[model samples]
Target: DKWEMERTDITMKHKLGGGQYGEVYEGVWKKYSLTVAVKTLKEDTMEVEEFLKEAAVMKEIKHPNLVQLLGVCTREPPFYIITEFMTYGNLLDYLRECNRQEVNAVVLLYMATQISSAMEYLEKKNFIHRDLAARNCLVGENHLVKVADFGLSRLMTGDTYTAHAGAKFPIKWTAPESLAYNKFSIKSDVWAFGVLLWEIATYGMSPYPGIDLSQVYELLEKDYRMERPEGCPEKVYELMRACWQWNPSDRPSFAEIHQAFETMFQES
Candidate 1:
């Protein structure tokens, strides 16, 4: 509610993204020149409370690796959330551009660190970003990844079921427990974090080892675990394995993952 747009025409040509809820567009508010990522909500499904809730969550947390919310547009038929834009765009596209092998290992490690830091910050705030994957994370000029797309994220409280069944959820990043129940916790976020790590190391490789959603249940039932991206070390693979523990409680938190990764890479 701080800044308002004076555009009588709310049409933006830049297609930032689109999801189940709505479309994200790139807009310039009154020729300010700053890149703005605008998410327009569906007319009938305007869960106004969700905007306020996510805004409150964003307000509570400020991390360099987390997207910054500039303001919201409520006057139009479709509500909009204005945030800073990442020039390189989301991680999926970013990886596509940087597809060449043997670029800078530092960039990959830094992205992994950025996401881990963001997740750790959320974990400290007692929230679970249920959707933590490359596609949800936006990449900037420096290949630094910022955690975005908070639609599926929520506070780590008791008995909160924001997501519904058969909602096109990203099963590839979900942990066993997440698919088992309608509930989510910090450990679930950790599970998603591990998958994010996998994506980072693999440079957008196919998650879930080329398996389909239907096979996930059987695979998990057999206690079949996941491995790290090919180039990642054995220790890294070991840590990732621990994160996907079928038992939610057995999974580690972002703090632990960050510390371990930092100790391994930064210290090295």
Candidate 2:
């Protein structure tokens, strides 16, 4: 449609970062005269059909808390997915750049609320964002938080997915069942939200600061959990604990998750 762009009409300004299957770039769309983030597949990494399947899925999704897909270019080499560029980049980098004291409870709570609201929408749509983390979320205008990096996302017809064996995942942010059995569900996403909450509260500290990755699974089996992030409110930490429940059924839905923050924002 009108959003389709010719290769020459788009300009890759610089490399931004990368993803599991493609490279992300800070680029520009000449027709609209605006900057955009362009994602291109890695040579020999993923098939064109597989890449566009995600593009088609993303095109159908629109939410304030979710990044917008501006356009696509499948007619040319290095097929690109052009998306609205975030001003402050990803949340992880944003938090890491600021002093912990600079971000107070209100901002953190608000961001979490926005993210949960977005996830609630996806939950309703039957989409599972398997990779939910601070690193994948973007900070947009007015300091808004928009969940981005949907490369690992999947639109499902069922409640659960048993990923093919050896599929890679972020171990620290993943749910126990997801890590243990490669089984993913909305509940597993809630577990990731817990780790993200820890990231937001701790100002982007790596989860499990002192533990080795090898021991994390064994430790979780023993009910070991990350310490409460310094300066995180008791209520927020409690909600994080609720998300980390061993049984997926025990976790709250994104609807309830946002409501939890609504209370925190109001009380604080």
Candidate 3:
């Protein structure tokens, strides 16, 4: 595709963050005078095919509330994926750094609404965002949030994708069926969205505070859900609960969730 770019055109400015495979940086697309986020893959850490798969996934999906893939440099080692820079970084850190006075309920609702809009788009496209959480979403200007981090995303050829045994997945934000059966689908994404809503309501508090990861599945089996955040509205909590329904079929779809948030945002 025409999304390929010259490696020299991107000037890495500063490190944003990194993980097992590579690092992300704030960079400039010199040819276009555009600031962008560059994700670099470590040499030999990933296969060329695997690296391109991630970019290919981004290439097929585009939405205002989803990070836009600017280009990629796949000609050689230390490959890079360029995307539109989100100024405020990830929503989790943005929310954590801000006090409740600065990020009020309505604003939080707006952030949730934007994320749900993005998820709704993916849902309609039959894409499964295996990782859906506050940390995976970016915050742009004016509380603009976009669903990102497609490393674990997949276009669902069937209703679900079963992860290989020993695959490392985010347990806290996962649904009961997903945790037990390794099944992932849009409904599982909804479960994660509920946790994201909790993160927004708590101003980015980690889900299930005080509970160990080892106990989460067991607790969930017992029908335990996180309590409402301090001063969170009952209606919002109800929505969160709705998303956490035990049966995947019982959980609200992203479209319904988006509408509910819209109503809440309007009412606020």
Candidate 4:
């Protein structure tokens, strides 16, 4: 870790997951011999306030399954947020290599367990993971899946919370309400997580694959939710359906989510 907000000579290592805004780098934590991920954002020409809000939230949170922000260095050419690095990259890649029914059941089971753990913690703090998807999870050392990226994450207290009021939602991952009105809440995240669950099971198949935007909208209007693959277990598939309910109010809460996965853990 040769960070000083002024050190500019050390070459940055490989890139971690990336988004529309910036890229995260895989690097070593200074002086600790521990590897860490560094999120280096491009210059925010007109979104400083938005950038800082996310940074502020990223700085305050910590959890076993949540990516921990160890430090920040903003005075560099491109500002950096250093955090614990996960070696296995995102669950998207993990799902890509998934052998489905041929692999160890514990692989998917362990992933769902950790996701529930992280979601449970976020729920307690009243935060919404607006972009909860397979790709958001990075399997850390010891194979622990840690959720990363706080750019679209937000806090919610009392009856109000932050939402992506006017951004283009990823249709394949969004719930019906979120797609219809650009509205989001815990239920929406739950719905997205359900898609994530199915992705984990089916080796990253799109929730409503082989469908157009118009077709997806029409189908959702007709109460047709995404279906799991042919052989996904009934219990897990049923739980995923509950999470993907079109009516946000009908979706399970994080407490229910925790219990559901815990039961799955025991059952499997």
lDDT of 1 by residue, 177-248 (tens): 667775577887788887877777777786877788889868988987766566787777777888888887
What are the lDDT figures for the candidates, one per model? 0.71, 0.84, 0.86, 0.72
User: Please, what are the lDDT tens digits per residue for candidate 4 over residues 158-247?
Assistant: 243434567777788887777777777777888888988888888777667778976777787888876767667787788898987777
**Residue 48, model 1: Cα distance from true site in angstroms:** 3.8
Model 3 clashing residue pairs (backbone): none
For model 1 the local lDDT of residue 223 reads 83
Lowest-scoring 10 consecutive residues by lDDT in candidate 1? 2-11
Q: Highest lDDT: which candidate?
A: 3
Question: Which residue runs does candidate 3 get wrong by more than 4 Å?
Answer: 18-21, 43-45
**What is the TM-score (0 to 1) of candidate 2?**
0.92
Clash number for every model? 0, 0, 0, 1
Candidate 1 regions with alpha-carbon error over 4 angstroms: 1-11, 18-21, 42-46, 75-77, 99-102, 152-154, 157-168
Candidate 2 has an lDDT of 0.84
Candidates' TM-scores?
0.86, 0.92, 0.94, 0.86
Candidate 4 residue 46 C-alpha distance from true site, Å: 7.7
* Candidate order (lDDT): 3, 2, 4, 1
Angstrom error of the Cα, residue 68, model 1: value is: 0.4
Please, what are the lDDT tens digits per residue for candidate 3 over residues 156-196?
63488888898877899999988999988899999999999
